[PDB]
């Protein structure tokens, strides 16, 4: 991917008014996490160039990962009408990121 995480993320109740299926990261372009997981999105997403990607940085931007009540801190949480329609925590392969990319796609 040509860019990298974003601080100046919306709130919880401003990202609550979009509408379209966006998955929304939480991590940053630093951590070795992230190191892992942006790879690994980057080998899925390029079936999928019509999903939305929010890059959240959780570190000096908002803390939204709260709000979402996340698991472990690298996960993203895959919306639909701006709401969670699933997401993937700690993906290790592209094969469990995939999976879950076509199903939320409505490729499943």
Avoid: I, N
Wanted: aromatic share 10%.
């Amino acid at each position: 991917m040509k860019t990298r995480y974003s601080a100046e993320a919306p709130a919880r109740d401003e990202l609550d008014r979009l509408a379209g299926p966006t998955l929304v990261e939480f991590g940053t372009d630093w951590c070795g996490h992230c190191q892992a997981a942006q790879p690994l999105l980057a080998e899925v997403f390029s079936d999928y160039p019509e999903v939305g990607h929010l890059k959240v940085e959780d570190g000096p931007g908002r803390r939204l990962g709260r709000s979402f009540q996340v698991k472990l801190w690298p996960t993203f949480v895959f919306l639909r009408d701006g709401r969670e329609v699933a997401r993937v925590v700690r993906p290790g392969s592209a094969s469990v990121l995939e999976e879950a990319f076509e199903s939320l796609v409505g490729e499943g």
